Design a protein around this ligand. Sequence first.
Ligand SMILES: Nc1ncnc2c1ncn2[C@@H]1O[C@H](COP(=O)(O)OP(=O)(O)O)[C@@H](O)[C@H]1O
Ligand SMILES: Nc1ncnc2c1ncn2[C@@H]1O[C@H](COP(=O)(O)OP(=O)(O)O)[C@@H](O)[C@H]1O
Lengths: 305, 438
Amino acid sequence: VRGGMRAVEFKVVETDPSPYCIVAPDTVIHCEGEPIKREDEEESLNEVGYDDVGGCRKQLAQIKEMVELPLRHPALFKAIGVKPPRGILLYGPPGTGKTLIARAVANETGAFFFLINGPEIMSKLAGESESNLRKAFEEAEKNAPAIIFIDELDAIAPKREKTHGEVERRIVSQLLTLMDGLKQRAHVIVMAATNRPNSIDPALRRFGRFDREVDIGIPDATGRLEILQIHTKNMKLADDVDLEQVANETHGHVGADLAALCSEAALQAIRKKMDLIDLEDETIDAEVMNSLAVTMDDFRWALSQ
Amino acid sequence: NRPNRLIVDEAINEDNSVVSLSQPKMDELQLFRGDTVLLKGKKRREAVCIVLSDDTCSDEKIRMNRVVRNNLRVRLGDVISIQPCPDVKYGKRIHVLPIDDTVEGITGNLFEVYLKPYFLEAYRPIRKGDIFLVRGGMRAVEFKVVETDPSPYCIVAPDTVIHCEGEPIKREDEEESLNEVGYDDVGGCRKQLAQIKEMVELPLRHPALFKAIGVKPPRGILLYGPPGTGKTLIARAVANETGAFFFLINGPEIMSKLAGESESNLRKAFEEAEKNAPAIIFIDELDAIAPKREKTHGEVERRIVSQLLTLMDGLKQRAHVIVMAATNRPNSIDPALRRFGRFDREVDIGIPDATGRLEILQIHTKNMKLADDVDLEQVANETHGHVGADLAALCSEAALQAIRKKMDLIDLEDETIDAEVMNSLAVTMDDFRWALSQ
Ligand SMILES: Nc1ncnc2c1ncn2[C@@H]1O[C@H](COP(=O)(O)OP(=O)(O)O)[C@@H](O)[C@H]1O
Ligand SMILES: Nc1ncnc2c1ncn2[C@@H]1O[C@H](COP(=O)(O)OP(=O)(O)O)[C@@H](O)[C@H]1O
């Protein structure tokens, strides 16, 4: 159930007409004050899903079929002799949803996920850095089927003309080795992200490595409208809010932009309304957050900064 | 929902005894042009002031300077209640002492140099426990009201006796010095401050909001502009002004530690800002740490940036902590620092305009005695491309020049400088002329 700028998950502990029934205007509803703890096999809905991605469609269609078999039907490859794609490279400017896309495909496919971030790896001491890459790959395999997503890849593999360092080079090579090291039982796929080919070390393309590529462009008008909706699903929008308009005027924006736009319009709304009445810094009351509504005026303010 | 509850906004009048409301509010409250009022705020505190009208003030808000705002224990944005106080009467005795860390360095008769001028026929209303500021002798002295005869409040009239029994009380933790950076110490920037202010308003003043909400507040604020533009000053003020915890990081400083010892510091810094959140982490010369573009080169130089990137992405939590950095321009910085969740907000602090300099000039001459011939508007008018650091240097030089001609030749230096002396000395337009001509 969505509201007060967030979503609450509820479990049906028992129904009178058991085990199923319809909740009618007369149905009494008990809600005895104690919040149950989530059970391992009960994925939170607050998780990334294909339904949290907008704009991409053809790209998702491709990626989906690419991982379908290896990540959902591993035995197939134990019995078969064909090779599934091994590395999927994601092209596009920042805030395009590459990470979001990779995280969803994983969740959405029950796959094990492990995120690697260049800046993060590249800040470890020399040697301590590679030990991590290996420890990472090594773990993704323990829990395969799994998806290893290297975030800012070019932060690790730029070699072209920009590489320089008896460590910088020692790392790439390490990544190359680790890549070729794949291929086994329940398969694990590697997904990386960068702004464009040119950034990456040509070696990473060499077939058996990142042999598949997907370019996530910038959304189109419809794409933004879509993205807008996704990021306003938990908030109360006034009737004057025209997302289509908002979508129509944000030409070259990317998801990260639109999300920021929504976040700002809501915080702006929170500052005029709630804020001035003043019911903050305590333990925010649901009813309050629930009544507050972002207005087209609030998105106007955001689009004008 | 209480016609007497108002949002404490900034002051137009720098005088410690006055607060401004709007006429329609003065009516609704039935208050007059000079009525003494009783102001209630936080930590069960109070203050007594004189209320004037302000056509630029809004019905809901109340303008009040940092002295009163502190006496009340409220920050801008906070709410206080106002009530009339006509029953107030002329004071008999008054005991006040200076706050130790505001008189170190000087010797002399403060009463004569400070109290006497400050009160003199102004009929300032004071409530016991009040702490007020007085400027002179090229510095500001802080005084606390230890006790008033007509207790707990009264007016200081030409007849009111004023005791000042020689012992300087020690400051109390929760009593911020007025000698601290404030929005009132910044001039020129306005729109930039307006932006930054609203950016940190919620996360730094209403943390729980984000515990209960799912929206993301800006995470990194990047400040663009040439040197001496007040970027550091701006960041330090927003922090103070918002009760936020502040932690300064300086590139050159970090980049001088041994390899590894340098990153350990960045982490230890971020790690501490979080301990005391809400907090503001200001990285000073950022480009001294993150230039990567084409100018980065070093199995340590790179290892640091990456470290900063990691630390940035590491943010996001309970009471939020915001990161503010400063550089001369985009180009200088590593493009990676822009990547949304990091320094996703930018603010360009240009060079002041004519009015901006006039403003800045005033701020840096508030503690000195200016002769009547001093024309700051002129001074402002001729300093075209100057920036705050310039104007401040200009003031500092004009005063030192004044000190060298006057005091200096009479010769009463190298001993324990007497307040009365420093207080009499006045910087003349001639002194600013000398400065502007070097
Ligand atoms: N197609 C999209 N649909 C919905 N949200 C998106 C999309 N693209 C980006 N976003 C928003 O922008 C943030 C983008 O960051 P991320 O997914 O890490 O993208 P990238 O890896 O390109 O930087 C996401 O967390 C999401 O909130
Ligand atoms: N807008 C301003 N208002 C008042 N003083 C200013 C302003 N800008 C700069 N200054 C003066 O210049 C010195 C500028 O240094 P700093 O604040 O560190 O600026 P920056 O970080 O750009 O070098 C400040 O301490 C202050 O005395």
